[PDB]
Design a protein around this nucleic acid. Structure first.
Ligand SMILES: [Zn+2]
Ligand SMILES: [Zn+2]
Lengths: 368, 184, 368, 184
DNA sequence: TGCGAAATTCCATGACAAT
DNA sequence: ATTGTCATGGAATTTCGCA
DNA sequence: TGCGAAATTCCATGACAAT
DNA sequence: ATTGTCATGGAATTTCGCA
């Protein structure tokens, strides 16, 4: 601060201060004549206050803050000081957007068998139809085969009623769902343990993780919309038709329908495939097992040019779920405990609870 | 002739009336002929309307080429005929007083009546809730003649609920009595 | 139909039917033995009905429809027939999504002078503050200089009150706004003509077109959010501070603040730039005119690999604005009258009104 | 010494009381010293509070290094002093009974009073709505001494509202009378 | 006439939205 | 009758201080 | 042994969302 | 304690029918 600036004025070299410039005194202030003009050199002990005053005018980032400061001052390594402050402005940290993209998505393996994994979900609310407002959608992971159940609420009770009917057919190893109230209830958990069914949940607020069923929801709504054109939206009576229509629709990339993948043979529906008429059922099942194992599986896409992948002990911020108007979109920083996979992490949230969390809902905290 | 397949032929019949359970009195029984797979639907009557309502659910999942039944009024109605014709389902009837399905189906239907009777007695009114587990049992019961259960034949995989301890469909001396007492 | 199929059965060549296959009769049906198996060849006169039945099962697109049909039938150029039908399914046309992206955005020239063009807009509603719920935001196109006015409604009356205060300073050639009720009213139109001000409007539902002010809205909310952290959202008293803070903030890419661009000299605010202290005002204005003309201007980005640009007389569909649940997202097809620019067109909408419309709200109608 | 600049010095004063117009009685006059640019704010009183309220608006757009005024009570209050000090604005006062701004400012203030008087008479109560156009006029009035209008000097461009037909600030024989009659 | 470090520039990323 | 924008903080590039 | 046209495959684009 | 998906219709690529 005062010491350094003293030595400077006589002309004795200080590391950081270029020797080729004239440092003089004026108005009780140490100054330097730099190419841009004459700047005041504040004592070291004054600099933080300065950086903070400039930054606080509009809570600006690195360059914008520096451009203010450089109007009056010069000192060695100014941006280092600016950045030190940005890294400590709580308001900036929790309000600013990230400018680093998530790492490239995973393409989880398709379940090996029908009934290995169900993805479930509610669509709605829809326009009321016979008192019904929601549709429970159940998608078998391996086959894509889907079951539809109309409900009056996306409740645990309605889920259990519907799934008892479905599991009359077969019992799945795993049911995957989002963190909706109807699936996170202890009652639903009991209903499952009672049956040997493992509940798996998506990370919170990340429907990509329920992509199988979410994507099927699109098709369901799309077909309903078409069938209801120029008629009142009376969808209740169409659910069975839609279910059957979609279960018997080809996926062009697979060259099979979900019905085919589930049974290895078409039922008495229009345009039924006849290519195994001369095989025995056993030969058919054999061919089916072969077809199931050789389906196209997509691969992880390229990372974008500026993505980030999470590291143990890294500082990261979780997105506020439903931020009020004029409130920060980010939680306070928190630490990466475990990296479950390159898209999924456990964090300790300064409370500190352990949360399992998608990186799509995180940003790396800026400025180390 | 081409080998037999699932959905080639569904065999249907009513069981009942049974003691009321959550408002229901009958069970519509559907058995696929090739696999022996069984679906059960609770109804309030052996009517065409109850049949159509129930089969509308089943036929939302798979459609049989042929449905076979006895000459029950529900199945012989012109309404039920209209329904089948709409879905391209051929109806086929056993001659009156001469019911005839197939060995596998007859035996499957035997097991259904016996299994119900066994589980009914003691709680003859709680059967509505037992229908799912009854079906799982029937469908994961190994066929002595084929090497496989209906589940295996229908889906081409093992089930996550094998029913290894195949119990007696026979009644314990106790149940015989408490069932004899119920009918009093 | 019956003629063609007759000639075929004897063995006389027909264009379209490969000569190297055995065409026979069976069950009253013309058939062919193709590599995949034996297919029925329906008479020409039957084919449309067939394509329609298959397509209508689930209103499937090209491959999915074909895969159904090919289970039973073969005939020449099946997909041509499939596509002919897709192009005529009204329900598909207005329900399906597009899979062609808009052409690359325009980077309209920055207005040459302050007051050439204002962009205006309402933010809100916000949490009530002294009875106020909205902010009228006025952004000078050339400078970025912004004016903020708190209002109780995004109404014409409040706009006029605010803008009368603003235009005390200077009158703009043009005010650009979106199609909000407050700016489209005849009263506002009168208020403008009365003053020599040309009203310009964005295409409907396209806030990119008001990007200047929309983007400024972001900064305003972002700074408000920060200043209100851990306090009640009492924003009314902060508007003046925010206005001043943002008007005096550097844009890193320009190296100027909007205040500087507007006046060519800093007022008595923190860290005021002093580099023209020795110039006369006239020399300063001279330098200012130079700086204004040499600002960085972005250029049009590369088109994505599958974009479409509009052509006169092309069939296109406008996006339904606020589609009801289970209703189509697209209007019926309509024709491109004039191509105003590669991102903006006039269409005749079958009513037929003339609408000026952004291509971001159009898709090219599929299958010609 | 360095050349004079906009925002170097604002000159402020009250005009009034005037006939009530939409509740207001006074006009706070702000004139930038270098450009002659003029801002006008309607107030209900020549109070510190009205001054602070009005100047808070102006200082949301630009902040003067110095404000100059007479020794009006509103401007000499310790509250107003606190306000200036908060914004790093130096206050500067003409000595009592000896008002002194500058030639340009004096003349600008002359024009303001005359222009108001002229437009007031005939509608002495409608002045609230005329303030915007009064300001545009004053600010797009060519300065004989400099080669430019305040608009040009402040913004470095021509205006979209040139006021070419610079009328009389002088009163027509009619207005003289109807103004003499108003004060009766 | 070239080195290491600081300064500057580059630019992907995301968020403002609607009538 | 109209049309995207620009703060942000790592990285890439350039310039600086010194030989 | 290679041509023109048909068939098939490839794949960017967008939309399902949330607790 | 977990993880994107897949219909769609032009385009690119391959295969077909015929020499
Ligand atoms: Zn900050
Ligand atoms: Zn269609």
């Amino acid at each position: 601060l005062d010491a350094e600036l003293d030595q400077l004025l006589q002309g004795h070299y200080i590391k950081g201060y270029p020797k080729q410039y004239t440092y003089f005194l004026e108005d009780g202030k140490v100054k330097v004549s730099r190419p841009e003009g004459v700047k005041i050199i504040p004592p070291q002990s004054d600099r933080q206050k300065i950086v903070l005053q400039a930054h606080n005018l509009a809570h600006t980032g690195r360059e914008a803050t520096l451009l203010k400061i450089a109007n009056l001052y010069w000192w060695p390594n100014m941006r280092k000081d600016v950045v030190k402050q940005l890294g400590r402005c709580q308001q900036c940290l929790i309000t600013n957007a990230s400018n680093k993209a998530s790492g490239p998505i995973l393409r989880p393996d398709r379940p090996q068998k029908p009934f290995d994994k169900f993805f479930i979900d509610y669509i709605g609310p829809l326009p009321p139809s016979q008192g019904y407002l929601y549709v429970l959608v159940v998608v078998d992971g391996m086959t894509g085969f889907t079951w539809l159940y109309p409900t009056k609420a996306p409740s645990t009770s309605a889920t259990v009623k519907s799934l008892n009917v479905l599991t009359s057919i077969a019992i799945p190893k795993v049911i995957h769902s989002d963190q909706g109230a109807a699936f996170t209830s202890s009652t639903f958990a009991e209903w499952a343990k009672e049956r040997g069914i493992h509940l798996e949940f998506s990370t919170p607020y990340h429907p990509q993780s329920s992509g199988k069923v979410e994507r099927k929801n699109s098709d369901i709504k799309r077909l309903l919309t078409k069938l209801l054109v120029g008629r009142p939206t009376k969808w209740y009576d169409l659910l069975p038709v839609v279910q059957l229509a979609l279960n018997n629709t080809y996926s062009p990339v697979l060259k099979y329908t979900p019905h085919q993948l589930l049974f290895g043979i078409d039922s008495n529906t229009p345009f039924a495939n006849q290519d195994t008429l001369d095989l025995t059922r056993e030969e058919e099942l054999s061919l089916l097992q072969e077809i199931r194992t050789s389906l196209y599986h997509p691969s992880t896409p390229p990372a974008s040019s500026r993505s980030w992948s999470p590291v143990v002990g890294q500082l990261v911020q979780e997105r506020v779920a439903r931020p009020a108007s004029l409130r920060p979109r980010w939680h306070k920083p928190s630490t990466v405990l475990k990296v479950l996979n390159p898209r999924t992490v456990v964090i300790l949230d300064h409370l500190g609870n352990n949360r399992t969390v998608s990186i799509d809902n995180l940003k790396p905290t800026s400025h180390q | 002739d081409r080998p037999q397949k699932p959905f080639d032929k569904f065999f249907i019949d009513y069981i009942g009336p049974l003691p009321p359970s959550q408002g229901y009195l009958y069970v519509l029984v559907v058995v696929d002929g090739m696999t022996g797979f069984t679906w059960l639907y609770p109804t309030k009557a052996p009517s065409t309307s109850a049949t159509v309502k129930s089969l509308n659910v089943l036929t939302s999942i798979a459609i049989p080429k042929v449905i076979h039944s006895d000459q029950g009024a529900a199945f012989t109605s012109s309404t039920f005929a209209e329904w089948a014709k709409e879905r391209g389902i051929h109806l086929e009837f056993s001659t009156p007083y001469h019911p005839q399905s197939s060995g596998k189906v007859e035996r499957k239907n035997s097991d259904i009546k016996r299994l119900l009777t066994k589980l009914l007695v003691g709680r003859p009114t709680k059967w509505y809730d037992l229908l799912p587990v009854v079906q799982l049992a029937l469908n994961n019961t190994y066929s002595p003649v084929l090497k496989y259960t209906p589940h295996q034949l229908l889906f081409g995989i093992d089930s996550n609920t094998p029913f290894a301890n195949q119990d007696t469909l026979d009644l314990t001396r106790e149940e015989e009595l408490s069932l004899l007492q119920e009918i009093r």
